[PDB]
Amino acid sequence: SGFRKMAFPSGKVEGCMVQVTCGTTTLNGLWLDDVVYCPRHVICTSEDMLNPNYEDLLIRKSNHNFLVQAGNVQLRVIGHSMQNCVLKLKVDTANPKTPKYKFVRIQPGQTFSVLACYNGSPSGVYQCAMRPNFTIKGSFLNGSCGSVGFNIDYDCVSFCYMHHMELPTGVHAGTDLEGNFYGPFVDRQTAQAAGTDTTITVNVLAWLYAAVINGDRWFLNRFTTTLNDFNLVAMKYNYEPLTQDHVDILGPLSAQTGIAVLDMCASLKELLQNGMNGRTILGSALLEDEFTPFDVVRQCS
């Protein structure tokens, strides 16, 4: 029993983290096979970050200016190229700890584990979700850029995030492992606002199911509702609109608990309209939306 925000084991990714230094800046890189991936703004000075022309800045960089260090050993850079907002540094040694891996671009609402690193050394691991506005509410300090987010399914590490930026509002932005930013953000120190941060409705429902499975059931009411009618309440409270696809993905949890998806929606409705009256669900006094239905099934089996 018990329900905790649980990250994936971090070992396979720890073995891939290296330190990358281009003149003054040092950040983290990801060493997979004989390529090191890192944020392209490693080539920038804190002066450059206001409006850098990365193509021009790269012209004055050669292989030997990129110092890559795994632990305490230097790797020899034999090639470099820019792909979108990441640099791919070709080294002469394949990482002997390369796991089976894929690069995946995740959708908003999906969750993943982040291994926060500084100067190529892991510091800690935690679970996050890609917000609907494409930001993440991370814990990152200077030098954490290049840290990656991932999922582990069986023996394959699915890399889905590389950390790039902290926006002025204290939230975080980054790219997939092909260097494309999530959302409208750019690797520039400027005014870049996040959109409205809606709540991930499907995850809230999944978490309510996890609560029922693990003993907390006070919030179960006698009501039911319809998709359209629930979505009117969702819209008012800035929740993602719930779709039939969402209903279907909740089916297994619906079967396990014997609570129809629309009955659970009516209970959520009441929670949104009436609050929690100082009580708690799974140790939280608010509605948690960073558990996917998959997360709930995996942790509950």
Added chain:
Amino acid sequence: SGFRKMAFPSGKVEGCMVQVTCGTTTLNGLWLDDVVYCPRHVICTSEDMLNPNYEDLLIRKSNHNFLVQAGNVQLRVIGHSMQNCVLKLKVDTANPKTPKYKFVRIQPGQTFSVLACYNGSPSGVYQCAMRPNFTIKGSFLNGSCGSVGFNIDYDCVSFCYMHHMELPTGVHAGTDLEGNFYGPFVDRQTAQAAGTDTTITVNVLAWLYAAVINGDRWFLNRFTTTLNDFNLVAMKYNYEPLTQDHVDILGPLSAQTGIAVLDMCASLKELLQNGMNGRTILGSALLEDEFTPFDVVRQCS
């Protein structure tokens, strides 16, 4: 910026997790050097658990009845002994992935990372605290016994917990790596109640400091208070009594923020007497008490 409940990187401990089977039961063991540690109730049938005599049950067990498997390779058991509530299985092969490590018995209020495993394979990692009643609010399912809790300082893994039991109330009990249970619990399926679960006052104060560092400051009032007078409020709300030792440990956080410890206590006082009026602190609608002052400094530096 940002503040997250962050576990230690799990890699060094993953390499130590094995599967241990004694007749029907299979649980997790910890393979360090040429010894495998596991809960002694591996030798029990679900029938035995009501009131087992472990000494007698062990008499009918020989080295070859304990099957220990790291990944997909068997380890050869050349000796076994019972120390308190753990078995120490001597094997003929030292674990090549043994990290630098220590066994530590932690005090209530201190935090650690748990690597939840099943059949010797890691499933996930999360951060917990040893409650003042010596229980932990974990996420454990059948077969998770033998999973361990640890801290990582530099290159040394400090093992502090091994999981044994789920009490009827859904909380968890276990031992240090010398096999001594935390609190009054025993490895028996019986009526074993947890005491009153008081809140870890010093951790709450540390977390409020983390909030100030990371932008949330609405809860800072104009008041101050005294230790004795605050402790009267703490007692009423079932908070740990705050001591001068606690004040001293908060000193570094007190210096970093410029908020005197007793001023922060007066703010907490108000939070306890008046609630949070629907607002939040670091994304929580309640007072978090599973961050130590050390946890806050490490994550904030």
